Design a protein around this ligand. Structure first.
Ligand SMILES: [Ca+2]
Ligand SMILES: [Ca+2]
Ligand SMILES: [Ca+2]
Ligand SMILES: [Ca+2]
Ligand SMILES: [Ca+2]
Ligand SMILES: [Ca+2]
Ligand SMILES: [Ca+2]
Ligand SMILES: [Ca+2]
Ligand SMILES: [Ca+2]
Ligand SMILES: [Ca+2]
Length: 299
């Protein structure tokens, strides 16, 4: 029952992309560092499946200077990472979610091979160690938030630096039974690097960067109600954060790290918890290391 913060980018302290990993214990309000990844990765997608944490893709701007297709799995019982089958396509800022026993890697940016933001989508089957491409998004999206609700995968916001050259407020839902994406109600604000989590039947979109309309890193937060196809703005964060990791644990939404390129001009180690019963954010123990583009999962 811990929050894991996987990789990221420290553009303030060490000026480096991170392979380090920390785990948060909410009962004691303590972060602690565990086994690091084999590869430094910012913009890394993180999902939990079969008791393992998967770190999918990312960007290594320190060691290899490349966008990554490699994938690693973390076993908390032995404190070991291990590399598994890589994606068909390199992807940073990739969204990851788990549905029906498969890991979906949604969109991202390939700044190494194809030099393009991606609408493609791949599913990983752990029983066979195989990735396979499925129906692509309607719109290319990097820095895209992804969450699963009511048997559907939602792709929230992102940045299309290839087709429309715009940060996106649009939202798509994937139906695995028919291999179809469909566009639904868009956000009030365009957001790339947006954190997405599901709590109490609602999708929360946390922070992000609006480089198109407001030209600002965001502290605002929106909740999506699928029964009515409506987004609504709720209590904002204490700090603006793009590339923020978001996870749900014990009824609270945790917003982990990120980048404030508007107010403080710094990468963040701070962490906030959202209480939906009171519509309140509150700051808790910060990470040992500042990190934006950080992957967050709960296990
Ligand atoms: Ca500690
Ligand atoms: Ca290992
Ligand atoms: Ca390139
Ligand atoms: Ca395959
Ligand atoms: Ca472009
Ligand atoms: Ca469709
Ligand atoms: Ca702009
Ligand atoms: Ca609304
Ligand atoms: Ca700035
Ligand atoms: Ca508060």
């Amino acid at each position: 029952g811990l929050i894991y913060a996987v990789g990221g980018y420290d553009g303030t302290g060490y000026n480096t992309h991170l392979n380090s990993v920390e785990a948060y214990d909410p009962e004691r309000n303590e972060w602690s560092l565990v086994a690091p990844l084999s590869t430094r990765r910012s913009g890394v997608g993180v999902a939990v499946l079969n008791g393992l944490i998967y770190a999918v893709g990312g960007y290594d701007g320190t060691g290899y200077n490349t966008h990554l297709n490699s994938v690693e799995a973390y076993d908390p019982e032995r404190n070991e990472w291990s590399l598994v089958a890589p994606l068909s396509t390199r992807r940073s800022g990739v969204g990851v979610a788990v549905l029906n026993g498969l890991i979906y890697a949604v969109g991202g940016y390939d700044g190494t091979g194809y030099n393009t933001h991606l609408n493609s989508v791949e599913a990983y089957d752990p029983e066979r160690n195989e990735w396979s491409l499925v129906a692509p998004l309607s719109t290319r999206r990097s820095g895209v938030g992804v969450a699963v609700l009511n048997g559907l995968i939602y792709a929230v916001g992102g940045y299309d630096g290839t087709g429309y050259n715009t940060h996106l407020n649009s939202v798509e839902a994937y139906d695995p039974e028919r291999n179809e994406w469909s566009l639904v109600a868009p956000l009030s604000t365009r957001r790339s690097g947006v954190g997405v989590a599901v709590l109490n039947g609602l999708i929360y979109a946390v922070g992000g960067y609006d480089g198109t309309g407001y030209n600002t890193h965001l502290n605002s937060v929106e909740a999506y109600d699928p029964e009515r196809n409506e987004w609504s703005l709720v209590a904002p964060l204490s700090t603006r954060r793009s590339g923020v990791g978001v996870a749900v644990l014990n009824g609270l939404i945790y917003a982990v790290g990120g980048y404030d390129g508007t107010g403080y001009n710094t990468h963040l180690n701070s962490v906030e918890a959202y209480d939906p019963e009171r519509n309140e954010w509150s700051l808790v123990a910060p990470l040992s290391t500042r990190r934006s583009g950080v992957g967050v999962a709960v296990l």
